[model samples]
Target: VSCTGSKDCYAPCRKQTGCPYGKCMNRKCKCNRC
Candidate 1:
């Protein structure tokens, strides 16, 4: 639901409604909170 570091960039994330806050990189929704 949130990204505190680059480790959250890993996969297994769901693109259900769509991740507008982030880009789908390597199959995961890596949110750019920074």
Candidate 2:
């Protein structure tokens, strides 16, 4: 995902995309178990 912070990915990653687990690392959004 395109985001500057972990919080930025939270909405789309968890709520929409269903990350199961997600975070912003290495300047990117890492979606775990997506």
Candidate 3:
């Protein structure tokens, strides 16, 4: 899986990838588990 990085994201994955799971929220990144 791959996603664009978010500047507003407090701490994104070291890969600079998008949220590992669901989506970016509350200025933070959360992994969205399906």
Candidate 4:
């Protein structure tokens, strides 16, 4: 998935690329799963 703003990455697996814990970094979304 993709986004236009940080708000886009505020869900599980939708944070900052590979972050289960959502976060926007370097102008992108990622997720960190455990």
Using lDDT as the measure, which candidate wins?
2
- For candidate 3, give the lDDT of residue 29: 61
Model 1 misses residue 32 by how many Å? Answer: 0.3
Show where candidate 1 strays beyond 4 Å.
Answer: 1-24
Of 1 and 3, the candidate ranking higher by lDDT = 3
Residue-level error in angstroms, candidate 2, position 7? 6.3
Model 3, 1-34: lDDT tens digits are 3334666342434335444454546545654443
What is model 4's C-alpha RMSD? 6.8
**Candidates sorted on TM-score, descending:** 2, 3, 4, 1
Task: For each candidate in turn, give its C-alpha RMSD to the true structure in angstroms.
Answer: 9.1, 4.9, 6.2, 6.8
- Per-residue lDDT of model 2, residues 1-34, tens digit only: 3345555566665776584565555865675456
lDDT of 3: 0.47
Q: Judge candidate 2 at residue 17 and give its lDDT.
A: 55
Q: Per-residue lDDT for 32 in model 2?
A: 49
lDDT tens digits, residue span 1-27, model 4: 334465534564544345445434566
TM-score of 4: 0.28
Per-residue error at 19 for model 4, in Å? 9.0
Candidate 2: clashing pairs of residues? none
Where does model 4 exceed 4 Å of error?
A: 1-5, 12-24
lDDT string for model 1 (1-34, tens) is 4443565442334343344355545545554332
